[model samples]
Target: APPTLWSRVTKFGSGWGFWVSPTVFITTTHVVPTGVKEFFGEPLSSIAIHQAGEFTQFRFSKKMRPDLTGMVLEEGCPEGTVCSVLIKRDSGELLPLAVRMGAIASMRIQRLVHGQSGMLLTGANAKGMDLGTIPGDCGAPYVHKRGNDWVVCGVHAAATKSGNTVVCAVQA
Candidate 1:
């Protein structure tokens, strides 16, 4: 199968989210469908997206750091293939942002967030793009290229009402 933009940090009902470790995924809380918990921890026999891919239990444990939360994949990103969580860029304004699985190579971070977590403005402002990041673009990973590696610096906080240009996450 073709490589999914970013191995969509998605699931059956909520079609968004990204893989962190071979066994973990992350997404904003608002994006997490209500009662998504009813299915948490239980084995998700089948997944509905890219499947970059394989179906192991795409399980969610519960709350965490804030705004953005994480889930656990029983089997983890398509067994044989490699799975990696991108690194981060500190104050990376000149770096490019990964909007929608790297679909866009322009959106730049115009402002930066150095406040506490979960703040409505948890990231920096953005530049480039006419329409400028879409709804689906929300939750997309904001990454930067440092040296030879593509590191994730933040995420598009498309988590409604709260509009953030970037959201940084630490692997759980």
Candidate 2:
């Protein structure tokens, strides 16, 4: 099984005037589909799928409805699997990011442990972000600069603790 289809939306600054940073990544447990498994064994579980390449294009606010950019990240899928991420931006527009067979490195299921505490942070130094994840940002990718190239670090898993305080972690 592969990790869950998780994402993160990060906002810098405070309400109404904040900027959002979105990213997508894979977890340690997501597994590829059976057919893919039989052929490729298992998709690389630890490395964030976004690390596989660069951002080819971006769906910005003005061109989008509701002004939000949706994102999707997966490990492996059947030959023609399709996935979508919906985003609602500050401008009240809604947009969808479609992820298909080739959009991500592959598709896999995420493994969740019983009584797990805290969230998982992926990427180079995800631990640095002390805040947890929030709603409407699950498909975002965790990206960083590795020399001249930007790479994805991991995907947002979930929040282990419940509260008003924002907190999230990703599986690498």
Candidate 3:
């Protein structure tokens, strides 16, 4: 309960996104949220979402949260495309696709850890440390894997420069 990735932190910048509908999707709002004047000292809402080998179109819909962004794909993940459910793996080995876990209600989150205000809280219950993650891993999915049902528990929100800890925004 202490060491999971959901409720992690959020960040911005370039990264691919996953979709939830045949005509809609979401990503890191801090990175790809539409309708801003600028981000990272550059132009904002200028990036395009591409569906390789498949024709597509979309519109940025909402800022689901301060860090979670949303976009409506005119046609979502192509037919036969697969999406994986979020999983909580107790391992130091990091995957390019990241994850975190918990329920929408913190009470549903076993072994919740409270740290600071304004910053994200981490862990299924404070599991491991020094987990190496890349900057490109930002805006990645944090899911709690269930039997064939992949639940996106959160997004990679925060991480230490030295790689000691990371936070996921599973709730927001």
Candidate 4:
């Protein structure tokens, strides 16, 4: 069952993202919709795009960070922690999958450089978790329970070749 806190999960184009604060929505740069023409230099688009439950349109558009891994909104999601990977299905339902946090690591895609601060997540198999990380699940939220609330810890960026782990932007 999806957690009641699912309302925090949101749709970013065809992909899913989540709110880190009242105003900031976090997602991966790769997951950004093609409909968005202006980036960094201008706002999302003149089309007046609003999130699922939002009444007003989004106007401000920030440029991607120098790392080129994520949209700047942000997480400290520490190592050795267990976090829930928040994903949205094609049916538009939000779901949580288990992942055990690993140390900070670096990755590279071809010649493009992804910095070293990316958080490493081990697959559910070793954690005794039923679900595991999968590719193309970008823009999902890495959340952990804090006090009584589910807090945003990081943003899912990409899965590794081993398929047993996922590398996410922890300092998003």
Candidate 5:
């Protein structure tokens, strides 16, 4: 193998996450352990959440539910845009799957207090000709090719009603 984008994919507790800043990482709120409840009474900034990892540490400090998650659209993504989801597996393996978009529409997601917005990803394969997602894969990021850079379109949030389809957090 060669050096790849998996370097940016990281583990968040039992789920998944990716680096957003030098000190901040992003994950689906629902994937976070239930014991780590939403903060209150202090501007959503007076709380601290930390977890240990094999080679690093994490501290979650902020939370929000944006009405719409931003996406770098190109040619409208059509109906079967090719994309990929990167995840850090429990065995410490960095896995990347080539997937296809379900449709070009807004998808309903959980834990979003504002609006139901997201994208659907179908199929899963090491190379994309697609399949189902696995547990602890939440927070994994889905990327689409843009020129030469792999642009992040969203994070794996939850499975949709179809069971085989996956809903990604495309905006926030």
Candidate 6:
């Protein structure tokens, strides 16, 4: 949550070697487990990041982009609601990068009508995170720009028939 961590996680030029240009969004369902004592104290989660080579070669379908990218709830979200994706800060940093008020356009969600899940990460580094998001970043936060921050607004919560891909929707 600190700017130092934000810079470390979001700033791709810091030589961290995890930078993904164009910036695609992703999510994970696995709850990061911690010791009981640590759960109350730390309560963190694990997100998945593609290996450098795999990330470079990824490609997203045009249809998935329209439906999965940049989706937000039509009704404004209430305060204290959990909504948003949490990114790990610098791999070993063990911190979270919280994206707020992310909103995907309606035109994008339409693409979900007919498309496979697990679309490729075209331009950005793709990753997943826990559900303990803060206020403001509900729905799909990947596309909407609140000032200058790029945040995740949707996550793949539903599994497809093949079980290899997941359907994405606004983060609840």
TM-score of each candidate structure, all chains considered together: 0.38, 0.25, 0.39, 0.62, 0.55, 0.24
Candidate 6 per-residue C-alpha lDDT over 1-172 given as tens digits, one digit per residue, 9 for 90 to 100: 3343133122222111111122332222222222332221222232222322111111222222232333222222222223333233433443232322322222223133221123222213323333222211221122223445443334322332322222334333
Instruction: List candidate 6 segments past 4 Å from native.
Output: 1-27, 40-118, 121-147, 155-170
Which candidate comes out best when scored by lDDT? 4
Pairs in steric clash, model 4? 74-172
- The lDDT per prediction is 0.32, 0.27, 0.35, 0.53, 0.51, 0.27
Name the lDDT of candidate 1.
0.32
Q: Assess candidate 4 and give its lDDT.
A: 0.53
- Tens digits of lDDT, candidate 4, 1-172: 2344466566665456665444455566566666657633455553334432111223334422222222233245666777777766665544576676776666654333231133234343422223444544676777777665456666676654544566666552
RMSD of each: 13.7, 16.6, 13.1, 9.0, 9.5, 16.9
Q: Give the Å shift of residue 30 in candidate 3.
A: 1.4
Cα error, candidate 5, residue 113 (Å):
12
Instruction: Please give, for residues 1-172, the per-residue lDDT of candidate 1 as tens digits.
Output: 1133244334323323555444445444434555443444544443322222111223344332234323232211221222222212222211223232211122223333221122221135433232233344333343333355443433344322223332332222
Residue 42 shift from truth in candidate 6, angstroms? 4.3
Return the clash pairs for model 5, or none: 69-171, 70-171, 123-130, 123-131, 124-130, 124-131
Which 10 residues in a row give candidate 1 its minimum summed lDDT? 48-57
**Per-residue lDDT for 27-49 in model 2, tens only?**
22222122232211223342132
lDDT of 5 at 80: 63
Give lDDT tens digits, candidate 5, residues 42-154. Answer: 23244444432111223334432222233242322224676777766677766666556665334454432221123334433222223455677877877777675556666
Lowest summed lDDT across 10 adjacent residues in model 5 is found at 51-60
What's the distance in Å from true for residue 63, model 3? 20
Provide the global lDDT of candidate 2 against the true structure. Answer: 0.27
